Amino acid sequence: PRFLEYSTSECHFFNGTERVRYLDRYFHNQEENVRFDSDVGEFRAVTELGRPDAEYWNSQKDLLEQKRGRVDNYCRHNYGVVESFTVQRRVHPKVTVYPSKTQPLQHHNLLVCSVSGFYPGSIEVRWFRNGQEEKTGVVSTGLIHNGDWTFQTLVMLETVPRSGEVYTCQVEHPSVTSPLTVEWRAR
Amino acid sequence: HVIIQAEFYLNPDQSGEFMFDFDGDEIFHVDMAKKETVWRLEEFGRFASFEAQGALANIAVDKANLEIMTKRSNYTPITNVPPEVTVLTNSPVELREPNVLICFIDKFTPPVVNVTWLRNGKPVTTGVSETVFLPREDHLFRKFHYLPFLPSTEDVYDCRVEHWGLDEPLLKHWEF
């Protein structure tokens, strides 16, 4: 058998550093037991196993303000230290339209539009055919964290390409001053 | 935006971890053995700094709180929640341009894991890269495993992941 203890200090920035919410969570074996919520100001036990702690830590005033100043000492501080390379990170998405199947001149085809590399996650990837915004059959994967600080997303368009029409995937992302687009004329 | 400092100590394996996370992304992690901060991205070290030695200080508190609770909870073992392996690619495959195979493990506990990349059956440490265990709002764990590879037509890769709570070592095949 295994046994795990896991702590978490959390800094919730609402609209920049305007409002912050520090949360000091204590978890044993997937169960959270105690927690210090900035909005509360005092240790509150979530489960009855974590009450002996909140009880004590609350008596100690030194421990209290100690955690209480963390909305500034630690939350707002670290935000401003890292805002540069994180909050202001913008990485160029790479759009690539391609048919998932080498189908006949006209048959049930899925047009994969793979948007990759971007950051932040916020983005728009619209499908169009001859000018009309094909809403009726998109099949996205959604944001997918790649682990290396860049996302990706595959927004397919289930469409039977008529031998004489073009499909366009117009992408819009915060890192770009204009949308990235890829046109795909029927093979 | 949410910045979260996560750390844990797995009692049996005496394994621990200290890390900072921003919107689901590791800012860095302290390498216990070398006492050195290991940034996710090298450019990060250039803009900020963190004192790795404090991490090892903290884990000491975790280990403690761990031994306490383990007893205070009459030695209840953690329920092994199996992982959701998924092999994908850094970007679309094209035969000339080289690509990166990504093996993502998701929703699992305890942190102990055992991933392997097998090229045509035999393991390929030739380029392997990885991350430590990352947190999730439902307090389970994520983890990535990379394998830069050159798009072929004869190689078949499988990401073989092992976990205590997992009958057989699940392999997760991939091929161009």
Partner: peptide
């Protein structure tokens, strides 16, 4: 001056 990141510390539980 390279900025530094502050770490919070988990309080020790009683026994």
């Amino acid at each position: 001056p390279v900025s530094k990141m502050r770490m919070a510390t988990p309080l020790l539980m009683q026994a």
